[PDB]
Design a protein around this nucleic acid. Structure first.
Ligand SMILES: [Mg+2]
Ligand SMILES: [Mg+2]
Ligand SMILES: [Mg+2]
Ligand SMILES: [Mg+2]
Ligand SMILES: [Mg+2]
Length: 87
RNA sequence: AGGGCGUGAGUCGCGUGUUCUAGACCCGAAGCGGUGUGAUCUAUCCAUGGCCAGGAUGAAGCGUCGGUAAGACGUCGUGGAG
């Protein structure tokens, strides 16, 4: 998250070239952040405050995915298929 | 002074009684000491071999599925532990 791969993620998950805040981009960014924080917590199992931040990110991503699936179910399926298949 | 002790037959053989030192009239311990013999029984150990019909039970592990942010965990199969 030195903004390099963040911009990369924004551009390769954007719906249109100017898109930077749509639910797809938000879910992609949140998933990358959840992965990074999961690794950090695996290193530091005792970081309860960061784990709470991780849970907040998880819930936010869940609500965004719920909105996406409520609007366009096939788009939701494609997005989650790209993003870890929702296991 | 009074008193104690003292004022010629012995000695050597043989026999014999008792006795001394020797096992000492004879028999009998449990045990003590010295030096050896034994681990072909048995106790433990050491090296090197053998052996344990048959039938049960179903531990880890692994895998599937479910679960989760990752899990834990659940489920099923597999597995064959003591
Ligand atoms: Mg004595
Ligand atoms: Mg002795
Ligand atoms: Mg003796
Ligand atoms: Mg000997
Ligand atoms: Mg022997």
């Amino acid at each position: 998250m030195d903004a390099a791969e963040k911009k990369k993620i924004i551009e390769e998950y954007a719906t249109h070239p100017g898109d930077t805040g749509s639910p797809d981009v938000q879910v992609a960014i949140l998933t990358k952040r959840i992965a990074e924080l999961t690794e950090h917590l695996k290193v530091h199992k005792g970081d309860h405050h960061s784990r709470r931040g991780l849970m907040l990110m998880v819930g936010q991503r869940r609500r965004l995915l719920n909105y996406i699936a409520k609007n366009d179910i096939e788009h939701y399926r494609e997005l989650i298929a790209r993003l870890g298949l929702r296991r």
